From Swiss-Prot, chain A:
Disease cited in the entry: Retinitis pigmentosa 60: A retinal dystrophy belonging to the group of pigmentary retinopathies. Retinitis pigmentosa is characterized by retinal pigment deposits visible on fundus examination and primary loss of rod photoreceptor cells followed by secondary loss of cone photoreceptors. Patients typically have night vision blindness and loss of midperipheral visual field. As their condition progresses, they lose their far peripheral visual field and eventually central vision as well.
PTM entry text: Phosphorylated by PRP4K during spliceosome assembly.
Originating species: Homo sapiens
Protein name (record): Pre-mRNA-processing factor 6
Assembly mode: Identified in the spliceosome B complex. Identified in the spliceosome C complex. Associates with the U5 snRNP particle. Component of the U4/U6-U5 tri-snRNP complex composed of the U4, U6 and U5 snRNAs and at least PRPF3, PRPF4, PRPF6, PRPF8, PRPF31, SNRNP200, TXNL4A, SNRNP40, DDX23, CD2BP2, PPIH, SNU13, EFTUD2, SART1 and USP39, LSm proteins LSm2-8 and Sm proteins. Interacts with ARAF. Interacts with AR and NR3C1, but not ESR1, independently of the presence of hormones. Interacts with USH1G.
Placement of HAT repeats on the sequence: 6-32, 33-64, 142-174, 176-208, 210-235
Tissues of expression: Widely expressed.
Subcellular location(s) of the protein: Nucleus, Nucleoplasm; Nucleus speckle
Signal peptide residue numbers: none
Functional note: Involved in pre-mRNA splicing as component of the U4/U6-U5 tri-snRNP complex, one of the building blocks of the spliceosome. Enhances dihydrotestosterone-induced transactivation activity of AR, as well as dexamethasone-induced transactivation activity of NR3C1, but does not affect estrogen-induced transactivation.
Swiss-Prot record, chain B:
Annotated function: Plays a role in mRNA splicing as a component of the U4/U6-U5 tri-snRNP, one of the building blocks of the spliceosome. May also bind to DNA.
Cross-link Glycyl lysine isopeptide (Lys-Gly) (interchain with G-Cter in SUMO2) residue location(s): K10
Record's protein name: U4/U6.U5 tri-snRNP-associated protein 1
Parent-protein start and end of this portion: 179 to 267 of 800
Summary of the tissues where the protein is detected: Ubiquitously expressed.
Name of the encoding gene: SART1
Residue list for modification Phosphothreonine: T11
Record text on subunit structure and interactions: Identified in the spliceosome C complex. Component of the U4/U6-U5 tri-snRNP complex composed of the U4, U6 and U5 snRNAs and at least PRPF3, PRPF4, PRPF6, PRPF8, PRPF31, SNRNP200, TXNL4A, SNRNP40, DDX23, CD2BP2, PPIH, SNU13, EFTUD2, SART1 and USP39. Interacts with UBL5. Interacts with IVNS1ABP (via Kelch repeats).
Modification after translation, per record: Sumoylated with SUMO2.
């Protein structure tokens, strides 16, 4: 009703008598005062404690009014709540939080939450292939943060299949990132040079970009050492 | 007639922030407060002698 300040004051006066009100706590989190926003989050903690959704609200607040260090600290606190409070991490909640932190806030906390949900909560047997598919689907709904989370979940562990790295490089090309394609090629070549997806894919991306001299330089780089068969020579 | 009856009752069913102060005072106030006879005349459609 026509007044955000009066609304905040009324919500503070009501929440003093309404502890279990997630919507009221979230409204108070938007009080348009960073220090007072942190104070309101601390009061909500002193209110009905952060069990399931107030953790997500605090993560979003850290995404907006804060940096990545405090965001990661809050993510670790939520992971502690993921076992002490007795509430496992849900894939839909992680995807919704990533989308909200990409649309409104910074993508750093979205990526941190995606990493915390792909490492803890969603990990079944040595593969994280389902995690890779979920992160690709989130990349179809969010920014490149989901693709970066997929890369963190896959490339950091021993890459059993370089095709995930090739798909990430193709997505980076769809994002117009050639230096990121080179970095992914370097990571995959030093982790799994057992196919034509590390150096050959980068050489093809350079030869399909539009810079003929840069394509020739990339071909020279990939054919001098030649970490493949004579296919690099044909290219 | 109903309109005559429904006129003498105010239909308020002043400010905003001091109203929230009023609400705070009301919260303080409520916190302090917390601290065989019925069958006479009935007719029977039967002869009295008919009852053994």
């Amino acid at each position: 009703l026509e007044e955000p300040e009066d609304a905040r004051i009324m919500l503070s006066r009501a929440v003093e008598c309404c502890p279990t009100s997630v919507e009221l706590w979230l409204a108070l989190a938007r009080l348009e005062t960073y220090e007072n926003a942190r104070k309101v989050l601390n009061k909500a903690r002193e209110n009905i404690p952060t069990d399931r959704h107030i953790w997500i609200t605090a993560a979003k607040l850290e995404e907006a009014n804060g940096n990545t260090q405090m965001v990661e600290k809050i993510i670790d606190r939520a992971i502690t709540s993921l076992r002490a409070n007795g509430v496992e991490i849900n894939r839909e909640q992680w995807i919704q939080d990533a989308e909200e932190c990409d649309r409104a806030g910074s993508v750093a906390t979205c990526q941190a939450v995606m990493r915390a949900v792909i490492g803890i909560g969603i990990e079944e047997e040595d593969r994280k292939h389902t995690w890779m598919e979920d992160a690709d689907s989130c990349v179809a709904h969010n920014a490149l943060e989901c693709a970066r989370a997929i890369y963190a979940y896959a490339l950091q562990v021993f890459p059993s299949k370089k095709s995930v790295w090739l798909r990430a490089a193709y997505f980076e090309k769809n994002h117009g990132t050639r230096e990121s394609l080179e970095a992914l090629l370097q990571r995959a070549v030093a982790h799994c040079p057992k196919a034509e997806v590390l150096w050959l894919m980068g050489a093809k991306s350079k030869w399909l970009a539009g810079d003929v001299p840069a394509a020739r330089s990339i071909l020279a780089l990939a054919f001098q050492a030649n970490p493949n068969s004579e296919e690099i020579w044909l290219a | 007639l109903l309109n005559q009856k429904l006129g003498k009752i105010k239909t308020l069913g002043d400010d905003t922030a001091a109203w929230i102060e009023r609400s705070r005072q009301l919260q303080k106030e409520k916190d302090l407060a917390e601290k065989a006879r019925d069958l006479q005349g009935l007719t029977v459609e039967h002869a009295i002698d008919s009852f053994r």
